[PDB]
Design an enzyme around this catalytic site. Structure first.
Site, PDB file in Angstrom:
ATOM      1  N   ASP A   7      36.716  72.867  81.898  1.00 61.68           N
ATOM      2  CA  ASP A   7      36.229  71.576  81.427  1.00 61.68           C
ATOM      3  C   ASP A   7      34.862  71.253  82.021  1.00 61.68           C
ATOM      4  OD1 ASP A   7      36.458  69.416  79.780  1.00 61.68           O
ATOM      5  OD2 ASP A   7      38.200  68.534  80.785  1.00 61.68           O
ATOM      6  N   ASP A  20      32.989  67.538  81.293  1.00 64.84           N
ATOM      7  CA  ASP A  20      33.186  66.118  81.559  1.00 64.84           C
ATOM      8  C   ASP A  20      34.482  65.875  82.327  1.00 64.84           C
ATOM      9  OD1 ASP A  20      30.813  65.261  80.211  1.00 64.84           O
ATOM     10  OD2 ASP A  20      31.852  65.521  78.294  1.00 64.84           O
ATOM     11  N   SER A  52      32.275  66.191  70.746  1.00 63.20           N
ATOM     12  CA  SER A  52      32.379  65.571  69.415  1.00 63.20           C
ATOM     13  C   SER A  52      31.324  64.484  69.189  1.00 63.20           C
ATOM     14  CB  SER A  52      33.791  65.069  69.138  1.00 63.20           C
ATOM     15  OG  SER A  52      34.147  64.024  70.025  1.00 63.20           O
ATOM     16  N   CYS A  95      38.459  72.447  62.983  1.00 58.71           N
ATOM     17  CA  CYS A  95      37.978  73.735  63.466  1.00 58.71           C
ATOM     18  C   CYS A  95      39.117  74.277  64.357  1.00 58.71           C
ATOM     19  CB  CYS A  95      36.690  73.554  64.283  1.00 58.71           C
ATOM     20  SG  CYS A  95      37.069  72.479  65.700  1.00 58.71           S
ATOM     21  N   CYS A 125      38.169  75.620  67.421  1.00 59.16           N
ATOM     22  CA  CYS A 125      37.608  75.588  68.762  1.00 59.16           C
ATOM     23  C   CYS A 125      37.833  74.245  69.426  1.00 59.16           C
ATOM     24  CB  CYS A 125      36.112  75.952  68.790  1.00 59.16           C
ATOM     25  SG  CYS A 125      35.132  75.398  67.298  1.00 59.16           S
TER      26      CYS A 125
HETATM   27 CA   LIG Z   1      37.130  66.673  80.221  1.00 60.73          CA
HETATM   28 ZN   LIG Z   2      35.046  73.082  66.952  1.00 58.86          ZN
END
Ligand SMILES: [Ca+2]
Ligand SMILES: [Zn+2]
Length: 182
Positions: free
Chosen positions: A8, A10, A53, A104, A106
């Site tokens: 990860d 963030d 996103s 998606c 991913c």
């Molecule tokens: Ca995170």
């Molecule tokens: Zn994706």
């Protein structure tokens, strides 16, 4: 093959301020650069896998993300952390930026970014670790056959569901090398 730490971003590398896209808002969590230098030293590949996103949302552009990511990469490299891969997902099903608006595989909990890293870098999956602050990080890790699933307390005030899916709960990525040694 090589074992890996999947990371990860963030909440795990940087402080999660909400849609971090500028250098001036990127703040490495305490002890995480040193912890990553030690994880390199113990023989792990290090692979970032980050949902972004905000790109699909139109908060920031792919160009802004690449600028921030070049910076993070150099800034780690200069501290003798050499990242093995950085994978990111810019999509969302409801994105307002059409290029990036989609389902998606991913987008975590989908395991696609860890699978792509696995084939690219030839990763020993069962000897590997996933470190994240959220349930989707745990779910991506299960799907991907990651041996050990580590939840940290330095991002998402954790949920009982995230905690159920995890193997280890640590205060932070800064605590991982000692937890691996013992
Ligand atoms: Ca995170
Ligand atoms: Zn994706």
């Amino acid at each position: 093959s090589v074992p890996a730490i999947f990371l990860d971003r963030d909440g795990t590398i940087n402080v999660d301020h909400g849609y971090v896209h500028e250098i001036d808002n990127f703040e490495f969590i305490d002890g995480v650069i040193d912890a990553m230098r030690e994880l390199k030293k113990m023989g792990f590949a290090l692979v970032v896998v980050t949902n972004q996103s905000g790109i699909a949302r139109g908060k920031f552009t792919e160009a802004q993300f690449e600028t921030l990511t070049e910076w993070m990469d150099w800034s780690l490299a200069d501290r003798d952390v050499d990242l093995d891969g950085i994978y990111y997902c810019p999509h969302h099903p409801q994105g307002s930026v059409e290029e990036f608006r989609q389902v998606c595989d991913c987008r975590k909990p989908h395991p696609g970014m860890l699978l792509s890293a696995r084939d690219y870098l030839h990763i020993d999956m069962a000897a590997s670790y996933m470190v994240g602050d959220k349930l989707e990080d745990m779910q991506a890790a299960v799907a991907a056959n990651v041996g050990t699933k580590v939840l940290v307390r330095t991002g998402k005030p954790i949920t009982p569901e995230a905690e159920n899916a995890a193997d280890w709960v640590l205060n932070s990525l800064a605590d991982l090398p000692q937890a691996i040694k013992k």
